[model samples]
Target: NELWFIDAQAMFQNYANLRSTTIGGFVFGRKARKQVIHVLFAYAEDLTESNRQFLESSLSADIELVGNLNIDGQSQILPGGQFTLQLTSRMLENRSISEFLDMNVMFNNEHVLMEGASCVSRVGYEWSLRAGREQEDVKSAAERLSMASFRFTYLNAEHGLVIREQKPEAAQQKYLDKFSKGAVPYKDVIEFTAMQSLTFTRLVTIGEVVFPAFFGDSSLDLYKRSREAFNRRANNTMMVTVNGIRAGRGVTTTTSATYLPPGWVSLLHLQLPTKWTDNEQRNYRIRLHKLFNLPSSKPVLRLSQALALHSESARLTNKKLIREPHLSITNYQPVGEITTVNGPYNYHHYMQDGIDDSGWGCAYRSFQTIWSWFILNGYTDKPVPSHREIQQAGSRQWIGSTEISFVLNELLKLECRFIATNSGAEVVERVRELARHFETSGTPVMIGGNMLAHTILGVDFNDTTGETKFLVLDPHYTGSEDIKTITSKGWCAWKPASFWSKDHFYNMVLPQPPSDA
Candidate 1:
């Protein structure tokens, strides 16, 4: 139950069917028999006739102009804003969810721009078991009503969007055929709820139940399978959409949003077993409860369009650090005689005497150094904390590239991009591009592999031979941070392009300044 802002221009450009408009602030809710869709627009403070006409003309035929809320003329709304618009829709028509977004179009000198619009549809039924019911009985009820398996039909982990498609066309068609006459579809709702619970439980186990980078691929698979079952039970239920928006953007700016329709509460509880330990049960409850509450009402056609817009917004903004190079740069070098760009940050050793800091601390120390550089360069307001402090905050045995990107974004307020490859051989050329970023941004990069991780401080290249080498700061040293010791021990040294392996996978975390800066 959150309000999401639509990026009208980007949406129109990306989706051909969608026209453009100037409205914003979308929220969908259902009240008994009535379906509600709310949108906020920037009306002029004077409430001019021209403004009214502009707003009215932007809406589609399906939307009924409800009313408006006139807050302080220049306060809550835009500087000269007049009020917020409340609109309503009854049906989704025969189009898929995405088609509803096409309704909002504003004419700008004959050019159409997508204005904000919303979709609303029937809300799914709620499921609950009696408090006194036995655990075994609850389990039995869930199993009888739920599907046997599920799988994610589409998943783009980088953007935190997943589509779990309905499966077993025969069973799905049966449910759809039975409900074709506008029946209540109670049997479908019960089974859908049951499968939803199983699906959420699986997601929780895999660590993807929450916002950001949730892990546990096996759990994700199970969750996907459960969702497919749920979709099959609910006619018109093609897929369950999971849209995650990073904090500080859109309507829920301060807090992140992970929109999971029909919600994640009852599902996790029903999936819990009777044989669970206290700690295990407590943990499961915590994870299950963390999901955002579902909208109390049902979905209509327009609501799906709003969701499509929201989910697509998330995907579009989840850009990568490295894109396909437009031009080749076999032996490209920075202008002038600049041979290196090392940061004046403290060194952190990943290995110490009698302490096996080998596997889990490389990325940690790399981040530590980068954080130190930010502080030294006045990019961050706070001082750098210890590596252990950061690791403890992350709550992971070993840090992954995505996890590091999240920290850079959430904690440091810095923009981070990730580049990954299946084999180590593809890492060098990518590193060349990274080196270009280093020369321009003067930012250090953290590169990690199966069990090895290092920081790139600078690069050296020859224009004629196309020979490139990276100055690596190895965290695997087992000694102090003395420069003499590091040099003599061969800890901080130059590594040739051939240093990377061809078989292993690799991940690189690159941090950049804010776009406006």
Candidate 2:
């Protein structure tokens, strides 16, 4: 056994480069063109006898000691038989250095002596996995394996190798509140009020579905030609009505120099009750007469009025009016002045098919046709007339109620078909009957192939002011259901119409029929 007291601080100062390199070696392994340092130092100045026994147990025979001697502050050198010895002198200059010397010397023989000193510097013992196999270095290998195993175990556990935590249902509830309510219409939550009257009948008419006549030729060319023809005349004129009046005496087009043969003109007439005061009645008459006096106007005939009463038990209802989509009509009447008789004011209504215009029954049918027409024809190249085709012409630019007389003139032509070769006055009488029945029972109706009606009812006429009110019903059906609440009160037939009806049409009275039930 060899014993040596190394004044570590003095030895470090004497060999500063070696001392710094030693510290560096602890951090990094041997680098280029240099040898690796190997050393170990421990203290046990007051170790118990049991600890000394443990030290004895830790040593092995294959390990060998190179030198054994007690060191003092001396320049004397002694080399072992198997290793070289280098000696140098160091003087203690501080109390710390003196204490280091005293403690190092006391720890030598008091605790333990190294029995495997040579093994500390051997290749397999210094570094590498093989060092783990040497019993002399087992403590170090055990410590390193403990750290590495701890890290690998942690990583495996992190990746769900050992156990998985439970999923918490409560945590997911925080994000689910928004989906709790389902989507619904605005009418579902809000209450809507509509008026009811015994004389008011909300009419909706739908056309019977009819497929185009096949006409035998099923070839693509035949179909194309037929479709083109329909596109030009019949299809474009699906809603046209003639008023039995010529276009003009000298009107001309490129195809012809003469006036247009009396073509169909669409008309709307409102036969309202004479509820207005006498002053209002006179004003209304003067207004109508003055309106029709324009260059392209029609004549007005005074339809008679009579006393009427609505029964309390009569059924009363309201409905949504079906309006055609993408179709517009413009009528121009020249009101020469702003006088009470010939005011330049106008009234207009544009029809755009939407939730506001669509209804459940007849209204739905009428709107569907209007929608179909535009879908087939309304486009940039082939625009639907009075709608999107001519930028200046639109439903918003109605000339006046006077031009509506032109439309009545066209409806007069239909009367001719009913009464062949009749004079103009005779045709007007038949038309009056059709108009009377339409206002009362909504019967004897005229509708286009598309199911849209050209019918108009005189709702109320303020004979006192010459102001006439009318109701225009789409040829669509409105869904109706028994009003269970009212039906229980002996009003068994009372029913509420569908939401589509209230959305489009509402409580407005139409003219009473001539006959009473």
Candidate 3:
């Protein structure tokens, strides 16, 4: 801890800078899941009447390491490290370590890794600035102090939990062979170490940090909270506890200097399985830090998921499955301009993915049709994620417009407008709004019925007599992708205003097309 030259504040700021831009997160290279130790060592003699300065006041430290057989398994405090030091006012007045005997570089054989690390020697040189000493005199002072103590001891003003870089970007993931059975070769993957940083806010009297939620399992919340912990002030010596035994005792004591503002700090924890080995535990901790449910250190691909991915050619885009099948269908009323789906959109319906989705696959098929429009209109390059991959991106059996919107945002990065109505009659009134969307956004919309889902391609309306016929892409079709069968059999055709039943409510999703080229 006596690495006296380094500044805790800058390290805190620098790590935060790189953290924002670190994409395709870090690959863990170690096997140990690091355990955090907040060691508090403080001493104040209450100098009530000791104006006399000859006492040679002494301070020593020892700790009770919280032993864990893994959380929820069993835990107890075990004997930890011990150390002591004798200091007087003369020590700092003179700023020199005299009578230093025990040592490391000159007294022991421990290795110092200055090979490629950002160390603190030059920082110490900078601090010697205010001293007004000659550069040679400061070098003499730097070499004067011996970093040593009596027996084996560790408590010192040193490193804390921080994000550290171990491997360089140039030398990561070296070998390039197709070993994992995938046709594509993995390349240029980046990895770095999440190092621990010591902070000035570490209260010598100790404090409490509570984590009410298990964050980032599925998160930015974890990285955010984890990073925040490093900068949080170490206040309140009260021991923080969970059901009494988890932490000893602590309350967040707020003083006027550092007021407990509206958003106070809290502690967060990880769930390490008891049966895991070193590497397994390390993976768990690393994944939690790689939060926001982002791509993991390695590709966590599933066979069902693997079978449902990218190919060279786009799906159903070569004029297949009948592009916009509603073109051949007769509109009941030629009341207004046909603001149909602006571009070719592959017809997506039930039983198309070799799976029988006759009951709960309607919204998914509708989602796919809208997604297909995004691909076909030069909006996106990614193929429509397979229904299996759709489930991987979203829900259980059936999903509504919200779930569709969820994947649309996460997968496609698209913004969507939601339309909610009390009944089908209310939705008919909103058909003008629907017509505006087709005219402006030029995108397909999915209307989720109470238990059914269908895609709206365009609208046919008469403003004078209030007549209307909405073009629909019915996803409930279980037949093969035969254009004549789908269009001629009324599966994908225009529907009268009576199609909106008074008994059913509807929530619709209209995904806005991107403005970019």
Candidate 4:
């Protein structure tokens, strides 16, 4: 509690600005138990007398007042006085500090990877044989036999098909001389012919042999065929799963060479298994469960939901008060326009409430389209087109000279002089408002209902003198409304014009120049 004396009006001014007031209370007033401290603040006290009374009444109900001294032994009540006043104050909790000290959890890391694999076999193999072999019978009589021995030689070649044969002992000595080691000599050769009979149980050979130079060129091809065959057999029963959930299955092979037979190779890459680590495994498990019929037993996925964000703000004051925080959630959607040749003059409106129009026709269209048309057709305020003979000689249509002049005159009247402002943003804003009005109240008419294109004239202004002069405009190129009308109506009529070709009018106005930025 505190005591103060001040002019009544000045006291109120302080309370209004600072949102806190000093009260000067007296024990006695015109009526007993009715005397209260006069709270002070600016501006808020001048609305009306009733408001003033309300403030005065609130003070008495809220504060405890005590008399200091009476006027000349008789109490003289005045708006200003020195009195004992109770200023009930309360402590405000510092929520910002608590918020700053709070802990938070977030998921910021991400990884993407391929998942499980499986293998299946294709086609069955069959075999058949032709009969042409000698047979042994029990009645076979003893045949005359002759002992025979044959000598064999091994040959080595460098380039051509010709090979130099070496004697058995000589070849052995040569190999020993070259390698500085003992070598074995070749023995006799064994040859077989049709209808010859031989008995054998098993024969085994193990070692490696390097093919001659002629075979090296076809090495890749042979390796590919062998690798593919191996893959086909190996993939017949394999199934791969990512994160314990099967992804996809097929046969695959690593031939170590690029040249291979063209076909569907269901070969699994080795790197895929290592890539599916813990976090990635978890994510894929969830995705696979959703995509396929895979079941996810772990509940870790529920923890990944987005958390709601919270915030608070407060107004400080000296008096005890109760406050409840106010909050609201707002979602922002981007506002923009998309144009298509099929729907030239149509517009789409997405307001705060909802989508009001999926296709907003020409009525609510903005003037930016017209401005764009003007700019594209070569009617920018500062002249961008040159009138040089050699450069401009190719085609007069490039200048769109007549149409440019016409659009400039209408554009000047509609924007420059009408708005009388150089701020393009403000002009666009005004045009938006104009668009809204046209949508709500203006007649649903095409660009120019009854007006003719030939009636409009182009205006050119002298930069130094600011003098405007009318130029004869070509009839084909007219006002913005006329152009828009022709465009939309042309679309309705199914005009056979390709959007890529600049011959289309919409293509001219909305020229899709390559975006460099």
Candidate 5:
């Protein structure tokens, strides 16, 4: 058996009735339980000295006051200050239920203002009880209680406590085993972060309640009434408490601004309002200016720089460059479709593998296409490498330019060069030079960057406009290779020269035959 406590509010018919201001309630259950008592402290903007004295005296007249009345070494109440205290039931034998009635009497006086125009009107409180068998360390209990308060008030006020189906019991073990073995993939991390954001939004939109029933009687009903009142307000303020201390606070605004709690920044390395545009950036700068009391002329670029520094890949070292070997090609078969107008150039029409597999395997799949090209051309006798093998060779979440070069040289016995270009013009110049070599010995080049990887199958030039276009094979599609599907879904397409310009750096893996020179 455990003692249950409920914190709720009493309702009145009209605001003119002095009793309408009563904002808190208490419910108690008797049973064998760990000895504990809870106390709440609130500082109100309109709580006058006379009203404060009446409230204190009225409460003391009924409930036995235990321990020091002072909180954080202060006995006086100040606006915007709040705290919670926990005591042992062993110290409250003299307390009476009537003492809790003082809360209703204080409301009867109707001295407190409702929260809206200037400040928060309602005083919020949360209650919890512990059972003797459910013992935990102070720190652990404190954390649990902090989370409990968040659920009870602010979360409940926005959306009731929501219940959802649980995964199979074995599912927990499966994830635990996977995590213990350190086999969790990078793709899983990205997916999980996205799911977390979605789940949070869903909870706020549709939630349910799960407590207060334990208090028995009308405790649950009173709790619901208080929550409804709090929600009806145009604006509301909330304070969370755990283990006799203030945990956090939240404020709701009339404007429909999205709220991002501070916890998300440290956890996901992202802030709320994820969509950033020029207008949003300007608004953010204005807010920062007001916050820091800075001049209007303050440069927002510094703010952007500071934020960029906090990005996940901001500190990554530059890719290590690999020099191309001097390989003399005696003979080579051009991979892909051949056209008489384009000479004996081989270009393989796109084929779709039935499997969609993982969303993150674009680089591996692109390499598979190149490997298939090599096999078709009788360049090597070895079987194609599996996707897992390619992933391992790259040694990161996605394949980098240097990794492609390493794999080509070490695993395929193909000499390769890793080219890093600074700008689009440099990429264009290099592509033109490579095109001259391709006319005689066609080779598939793997280009990686801009969050994608593609195989360059062919290139076309416009003599009049001096514009270049590339025939590219994209591996991000998740269907079987069909010529119709490939063409319709953009699996095979010609991209403008400017497509590669958006990437800060471009890596080209140019494969070569065994060098004799």
Candidate 6:
């Protein structure tokens, strides 16, 4: 019944002391302490006097709470009540703490096992039951599951849990990393958009299903029923464009108060401890039900929440282009702190895709390089268009920077900024402006001067000395996506201001990042 906000400064101070080998230190990181916080989060819509008694009689609980601590290089599960929770103070100043301070949680009676639980979900299926039962797939999935996890999580209104068993740890940590670094790549938003595309192709690639959150069925049977919708993806599924990527989320699923959708609900993730018998699992769920009757506020359980997404889609698309090929360059150093295009882009060059535009194809190739940035960064989902699509040519038609800008604006609905530099000297003086683009706009740039085209991946500017280097990707490269050669041969490498010609007027096309769409 008590909430807490504790600042255990000693815990962190004890960090170095626990670097002790009592339980071996984490190989790559610190060894995890054996304290799993199990919050008895209220799951009901809202506890009110009107439904309080009804909730008390409901028999079954609606959600979950489990805590685990990895020790001795193995997992240890605990009911979490053995240690009393840190309690809060009356002073509001103490409330300044983050969610970590409110760590007091409900612990259940179900016991912890010393060994691993075999059933980590693969959405719509279990890897152990797979027809092929790929041991490698199972092995990696288990490793990635890390030492421990939520056994079951929050349930949607349907009394079912939606499962997404991707990376449990790294996904969360990287979110703050991306924000702290400046711009969070729209990768998660893009993955959500991709899954919600209302196409059958997606229905299989990203899948879902339904069953009782936990009851009656054996845990093995539970995984099967949960997985059946996924396995039939080759044959089953239709886009319920009404509210999907199906089993719609966010807000209500129905069109009105009177009408309801077939399988949609405001989603909640249900994570339960494996190996707990059905009866033990039921106690936790019933405890959740009673918690709802308290005529008080309920908490929200979010796993695959606003913060996480199907990080797997990147691997699914699997276009292993030589992204930021300049990165592969050996011994190349930046002139400054190095602000570059934020994410990956394919290298587009001469004679790629059977286009014989050896002399004239450089512009589109440069344009294609920039275009791939949009694709990879989730600014655009479409693949990089070929020269044929960007062309009317079997003829040797060459496009320039302005033309590149026009195509980008017209097709991608992407904004374009054109900088008309009188000469390479002017381009050098605008180093601040170019750096600003990479800082904010963060798209690849195409520069055309003297009728030759190149893509600019970044601007390395030493603020102290005002020196500048353009990270350049030459579309004129006519070789394989060879990383070593590209960097070694200077096809994709850092260029000084001297790289541009002072003789000719330079035209640069910078495609802006997307706004709404």
Best-to-worst lDDT order: 6, 3, 1, 5, 2, 4
lDDT of 4 by residue, 194-247 (tens): 111232111111111111111122323222222233222222111121112234
Of 1 and 4, the candidate ahead on TM-score is: 1
Best by TM-score: 6
Per-residue lDDT tens digits of candidate 3, residues 117-184? Answer: 01010000111212223333323332332111011111112322222222344232312121212211
> Hey, what RMSD does candidate 3 come out at?
25.2
Error of 3 at 362 (Å): 0.6
Q: What is the lDDT for 400 in model 3?
A: 90
The TM-score values for the models, in the order shown, are 0.33, 0.14, 0.39, 0.13, 0.31, 0.47
Better of 1 and 4 by lDDT: 1
State the TM-score for model 6: 0.47
Question: Per-residue alpha-carbon lDDT of model 1 for 1-517, expressed as tens digits?
Answer: 3332333332222222111112222222212212233223332332344333333222222222333332222223332322243221211123223443333222111222222111111113322334433223333444443443242233434433333443434122222222223221111121111213334111111111111111222324334433432332221110110101111111110111122222111111011221344454344334222211212122111111111112222221112211111111333445322345433344555643234556677777677666755643335546555555666544437776776777777777778777888886677567567767776566677887667778777777665667667667776665543545565554666667677777788888777754321
lDDT of each: 0.39, 0.22, 0.43, 0.22, 0.34, 0.44
Model 2 scores a TM of: 0.14
The global Cα lDDT (0 to 1) of model 2 is 0.22
Candidate 1, lDDT over the whole model: 0.39
Candidate 1 matches the true fold with a TM-score of 0.33
Please tell me which predicted candidate would have the highest lDDT against the true structure: 6
lDDT of 1 at 412: 78
List where candidate 1 sits over 4 angstroms from the true fold.
Answer: 1-339, 351-358, 392-396, 515-517
Q: Put down candidate 5 lDDT per residue, 111-165, tens digits, no spaces.
A: 2211110001122222232432122322243344333332332212232322112
Badly placed stretches (over 4 Å) of model 2 are 1-221, 224-248, 254-508, 511-517
Please give the TM-score that candidate 4 achieves against the real structure.
Answer: 0.13
Q: Give Cα distance to truth, residue 37, candidate 3, Å.
A: 78
Ranking by TM-score: 6, 3, 1, 5, 2, 4
Off by over 4 Å in 3: 1-320, 330-337, 394-396
